[PDB]
Structures are given as C-alpha cells and as structure tokens.
Amino acid sequence: AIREGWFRETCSLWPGQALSLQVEQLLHHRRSRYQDILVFRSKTYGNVLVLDGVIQCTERDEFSYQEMIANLPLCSHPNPRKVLIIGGGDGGVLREVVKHPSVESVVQCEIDEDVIQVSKKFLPGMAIGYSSSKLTLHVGDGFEFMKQNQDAFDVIITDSSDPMGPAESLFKESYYQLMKTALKEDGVLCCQGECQWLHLDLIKEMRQFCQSLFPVVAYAYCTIPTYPSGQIGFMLCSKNPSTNFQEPVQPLTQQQVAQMQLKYYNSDVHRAAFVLPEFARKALND
Amino acid sequence: AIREGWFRETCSLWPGQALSLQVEQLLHHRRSRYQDILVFRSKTYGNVLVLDGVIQCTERDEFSYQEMIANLPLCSHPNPRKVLIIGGGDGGVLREVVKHPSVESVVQCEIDEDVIQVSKKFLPGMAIGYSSSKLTLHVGDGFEFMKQNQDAFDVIITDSSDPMGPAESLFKESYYQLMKTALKEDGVLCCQGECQWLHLDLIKEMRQFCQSLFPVVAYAYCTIPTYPSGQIGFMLCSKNPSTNFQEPVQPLTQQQVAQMQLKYYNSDVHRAAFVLPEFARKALND
Numbered sequence: 019a020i021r022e023g024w025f026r027e028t029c030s031l032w033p034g035q036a037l038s039l040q041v042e043q044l045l046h047h048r049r050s051r052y053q054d055i056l057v058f059r060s061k062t063y064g065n066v067l068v069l070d071g072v073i074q075c076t077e078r079d080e081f082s083y084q085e086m087i088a089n090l091p092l093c094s095h096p097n098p099r100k101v102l103i104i105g106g107g108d109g110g111v112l113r114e115v116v117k118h119p120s121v122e123s124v125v126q127c128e129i130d131e132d133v134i135q136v137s138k139k140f141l142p143g144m145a146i147g148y149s150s151s152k153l154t155l156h157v158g159d160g161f162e163f164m165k166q167n168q169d170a171f172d173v174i175i176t177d178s179s180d181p182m183g184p185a186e187s188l189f190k191e192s193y194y195q196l197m198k199t200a201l202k203e204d205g206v207l208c209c210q211g212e213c214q215w216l217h218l219d220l221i222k223e224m225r226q227f228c229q230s231l232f233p234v235v236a237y238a239y240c241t242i243p244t245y246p247s248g249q250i251g252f253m254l255c256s257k258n259p260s261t262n263f264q265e266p267v268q269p270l271t272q273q274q275v276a277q278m279q280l281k282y283y284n285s286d287v288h289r290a291a292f293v294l295p296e297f298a299r300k301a302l303n304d
Numbered sequence: 305a306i307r308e309g310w311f312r313e314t315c316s317l318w319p320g321q322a323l324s325l326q327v328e329q330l331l332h333h334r335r336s337r338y339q340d341i342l343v344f345r346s347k348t349y350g351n352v353l354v355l356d357g358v359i360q361c362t363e364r365d366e367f368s369y370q371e372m373i374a375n376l377p378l379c380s381h382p383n384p385r386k387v388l389i390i391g392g393g394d395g396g397v398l399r400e401v402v403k404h405p406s407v408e409s410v411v412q413c414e415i416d417e418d419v420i421q422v423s424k425k426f427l428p429g430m431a432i433g434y435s436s437s438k439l440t441l442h443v444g445d446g447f448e449f450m451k452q453n454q455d456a457f458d459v460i461i462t463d464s465s466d467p468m469g470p471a472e473s474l475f476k477e478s479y480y481q482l483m484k485t486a487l488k489e490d491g492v493l494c495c496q497g498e499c500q501w502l503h504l505d506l507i508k509e510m511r512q513f514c515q516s517l518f519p520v521v522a523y524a525y526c527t528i529p530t531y532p533s534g535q536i537g538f539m540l541c542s543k544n545p546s547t548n549f550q551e552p553v554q555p556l557t558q559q560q561v562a563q564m565q566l567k568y569y570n571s572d573v574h575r576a577a578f579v580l581p582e583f584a585r586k587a588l589n590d
C-alpha cells in the first residue's frame with residue numbers, strides 16, 4: 019500500500035506506468051460498504067484521497083479537473099439553473115457549480131456516504147460545497163437515479179470513481195440515453211471522458227455512440243499532474259443543435275474569473291481545451 | 305536503479321513525486337566522459353533513454369516534444385534557412401527540422417558523442433535525423449560553441465539534458481545573450497522552458513530576463529506523459545519586434561502536416577500551446 023514512505027498507483031487501465039507520491043502521514047484507511055477509502059497527507063501534494071487504490075484527488079491540483087468539468091458545460095449553456103452532479107463525494111464539483119448565480123438548485127447523487135464524511139474532514143477546501151443552500155443531497159446509485167428524471171435538468175455532470183468499483187454501473191453506455199432523457203430540451207452534459215494518450219480508441223467509440231444520441235458531441239481535456247499521463251478528457255453532449263462547445267456561449271469576464279477564485283478555467287482555456295494533438299484530432303475527425 | 309521490474313525516476317527538482325516505468329529488458333548501462341547512460345526496453349513506452357537517472361525520452365511519446373520544439377520557432381520565422389541545434393543527441397529535433405524545405409543547413413553541437421552512438425542503436429526512429437544531407441555535426445559544450453558565432457543563424461534550438469551533469473553550462477542566463485549575438489537580425493530561438501505546474505516562479509524570472517534582451521518573448525507548452533507532471537514549456541525569443549509567436553507566420557495545411565508525418569504539431573496546436581491555465585496566465589501577465 020504505502021511502502022518505504024511512498025504510495026505508488028498502478029492499474030491495468032494504464033499498464034507499465036506508475037505515479038508515486040511521497041507520504042508524510044497516513045490519515046485514514048477503512049473500507050466502506052462500497053470501496054476501500056484511503057487518505058494520506060502527501061509531502062508535496064497536500065492531502066490525497068484514494069478509492070480502491072486509485073487517486074481520486076490531491077488538494078494541490080484538484081482545481082483543474084473540478085473547474086473544467088463544471089465550467090465546460092455551464093459556460094456552454096445560456097442559462098443553467100438546475101444542475102445534477104453524479105458522484106462528486108469530495109464536494110469539489112459542487113463547490114464550483116454553486117459559484118454561478120444562474121444556478122438555483124444542484125442535486126448531487128453520491129452512492130457512498132462514507133466518502134462524504136471523509137472529504138468533510140480531510141478535504142476541507144473541496145467539501146466547502148456541502149454548505150451551499152443550493153444543494154439537494156441524494157443517496158444512491160446514479161445509474162438507477164437517472165431513471166427517476168425526465169426533462170428535469172439544464173446540466174448533468176458525472177464525476178465518477180473507477181470502473182472497478184461502484185462506478186461500474188455508470189459505464190453502461192445506456193447511461194447516456196438515461197442522461198439525455200433526464201435533460202431538458204436544450205440541456206447539456208459533461209462526463210469524464212478518457213485520457214487521449216491512454217485510450218484514444220475508447221474516445222473514438224464513445225464519440226460515435228454519443229453522436230447517434232445527440233446533435234452536438236465534443237471532446238475536451240485539461241492537464242492535472244496526478245492523473246495518469248498527466249491529463250484527462252471530457253465528453254460534452256448537447257441536445258441543442260446550436261450548441262458550439264468550443265466557443266463558450268457564456269464567456270466569463272476577468273472580473274468573473276477573479277470573483278470565482280478560478281485557478282485553471284477561463285474563456286481562452288475553455289477554447290483551447292478542444293484543440294487536440296494531431297494524432298487525436300485525426301482519430302476523432304478523419 | 306531498476307528494482308523488481310520497474311524503473312523509478314526521482315529528482316529534487318520535482319520533490320515528492322515519481323514516474324515509474326515497467327522494464328521488459330535492460331539494454332545498455334555505461335558512463336561516458338560526461339554522464340551516466342541508461343537504455344531499457346520498457347513494457348509499454350518502447351525504448352527509454354535515461355541520462356544521470358533522468359528520463360530524456362521514450363520512443364512512444366518523444367514526438368510531442370521533438371515536433372513542438374522544432375516547429376514552434378520554425379513556423380514563427382518567415383524563411384528559416386540556417387538552423388542551430390544545441391544538444392539533441394538523439395537526433396529527434398534534427399529529424400523534425402530537416403522536414404522543412406526552407407532549411408539549408410542545420411549545425412548540431414552535441415557534447416557527448418556516446419549519446420549519439422547509443423541513440424543510433426536504441427532510438428532508431430529518432431536517430432534517422434543523422435541521415436540528413438543538411439547536417440553539420442559539431443562536438444563540444446554548446447555554451448562555449450555559442451561564442452564562436454555572430455549574426456549566423458535564423459533559428460537556434462536548445463534541446464539539452466538536465467541542470468546536473470554537462471547541461472549545467474547552458475543554464476547560465478548569459479547563454480541567452482550569446483544566442484542573441486549568434487542569431488541573425490530577425491532571428492528566433494526556442495529553449496526548453498520549465499513546467500508551469502512545477503516551477504512557475506522560474507518561468508516568471510526567465511521571462512523577465514529574456515524580455516530585457518529581446519523585444520518579443522513567449523512561453524508555450526506541450527503535453528508528454530513521461531515528463532515530470534505530464535508536460536513541458538518552451539521559452540521563445542525573437543530579435544524581430546514584429547514576431548507574433550502565437551499566430552504562426554508559416555501556417556501548415558493539412559496536406560503538409562500529412563506529408564511531414566506529424567503526430568502532435570499542427571497550426572491550431574501551435575496557437576493553443578500559448579493558452580495557459582489561469583494560475584500561470586495570472587503569474588506571467590498580471
């Protein structure tokens with residue numbers, strides 16, 4: 019687990035490579051009903067949450083992912099008022115969504131209440147979202163939860179743990195049809211979407227699938243040192259055929275960026291996040 | 305060190321974090337006059353070159369670095385004819401440079417001819433650069449070599465090993481003044497420029513330093529899984545006060561990108577590479 023002061027992350031989904039983070043102190047290590055939960059204070063990345071041996075987040079760099087997954091869809095919708103977050107037990111996405119004054123209601127469906135309690139203790143800067151008055155906190159499997167909803171949400175965001183745990187249910191491609199049903203007529207979604215350096219083939223397959231459900235599908239990415247290969251992508255889908263994901267319909271002003279305390283996201287970054295290395299552009303377009 | 309089938313990279317310049325690569329086969333491990341040279345066949349990244357314990361390149365991902373470092377300055381010059389590469393023992397940057405019909409000669413000054421011999425054996429897709437009729441290969445410390453030149457080059461690229469071992473001489477800020485003198489009146493340069501997630505303070509210092517030497521200075525970055533934190537930046541300097549580094553003065557058509565066999569670089573990627581996360585935009589501009 020932790021050997022000789024280092025925690026090393028290995029996974030069949032990124033074979034032959036591994037990030038290690040040096041450990042100052044072990045903070046928490048218990049199995050919930052659903053998963054193995056491990057938290058440590060790392061030497062240089064602040065606190066680090068691990069679910070079934072895969073890094074969920076670190077306090078040092080969590081802001082890239084949290085801001086981009088929230089603001090990519092939110093700033094691609096002209097007036098999002100009702101938002102659904104699936105997963106996000108650390109509170110971080112919620113933290114970012116509630117910053118938008120157009121957002122009145124955020125329903126969060128998280129399967130594992132233990133994650134929520136440990137994030138409250140050990141990820142205080144992420145879990146600050148739990149004190150928003152916009153929050154409706156829900157419990158359960160997000161896949162089956164999605165079935166409950168029709169024509170209900172302006173924006174849905176899925177921030178999942180790994181396909182080996184409780185998050186497997188969310189990997190049934192039918193979840194995207196459930197999400198489409200749950201969305202209002204002109205709704206948008208953003209899902210965690212594969213690393214283009216690691217599973218370009220799955221992105222191409224997922225894009226093609228999404229394309230036959232939605233008039234507008236796009237792939238974007240951001241960098242984050244502590245994700246495998248140092249970055250991750252997002253699938254964006256709109257039921258609105260006029261959605262242009264690459265040009266934000268709500269461009270943030272610098273004053274807005276400042277007020278929101280954003281450390282990664284802005285309008286230019288929104289645009290560039292869609293510009294892919296040639297190999298990936300070719301794969302997904304040609 | 306390889307231990308239990310893994311190579312693990314640590315460096316005080318990225319404290320508390322490590323990349324490990326799984327080793328299929330040790331291939332070469334010898335000290336030259338200048339440095340320790342380690343080559344292995346990795347399980348999932350092809351052949352890997354390590355100098356004094358720091359990864360220089362992997363066959364699987366080397367292309368992002370090689371292509372960006374060459375095309376960022378070359379596509380920002382209206383007619384680059386005379387090129388200087390400092391370092392580049394693996395032949396990778398050379399490979400990318402000679403693709404340009406405008407280039408008539410490339411001088412490459414490499415300190416360590418054993419890196420050249422190991423790369424020609426173990427990095428054959430990179431060492432294909434050495435085949436070029438445009439090459440004038442030179443031996444020595446690129447620092448002292450820089451002093452020999454005045455008003456000689458359109459473009460200078462410095463692709464060095466790390467600020468331990470023989471690349472120390474190139475980390476003297478004076479080297480930038482030497483490159484300015486070595487450049488033609490409208491010459492441009494590209495140097496490896498620091499990871500914005502690791503040493504943003506250093507980029508700020510370096511940009512201020514370069515701005516007092518050159519009328520136009522820019523910072524861009526590319527992603528590369530096997531660099532610390534998954535990415536690296538580039539300092540771009542022009543002696544031409546009309547240079548706009550962010551908009552390529554030489555745009556490439558799709559046909560050209562196809563012809564050049566590019567896997568990462570293209571013109572949209574060029575422009576996007578100058579779009580920094582908010583925290584680094586703030587630090588470098590505000």
Ligand SMILES: CSC[C@H]1O[C@@H](n2cnc3c(N)ncnc32)[C@H](O)[C@@H]1O
Pocket residue numbers: 074104105106107108127128129130133158159160161177178179183184185186187188
């Ligand atoms: C920490 S962010 C990722 C979160 O997604 C949660 N999660 C995983 N699977 C599901 C699911 N099927 N439904 C709702 N939330 C989930 C995990 O418990 C974790 O908190």
Ligand SMILES: CSC[C@H]1O[C@@H](n2cnc3c(N)ncnc32)[C@H](O)[C@@H]1O
Pocket residue numbers: 360390391392393394413414415416419420444445446447463464465469470471472473474
């Ligand atoms: C493998 S690419 C990086 C290269 O830079 C070379 N290099 C390091 N220091 C110097 C120097 N002072 N002058 C020229 N080349 C150098 C290294 O030997 C290596 O081949």
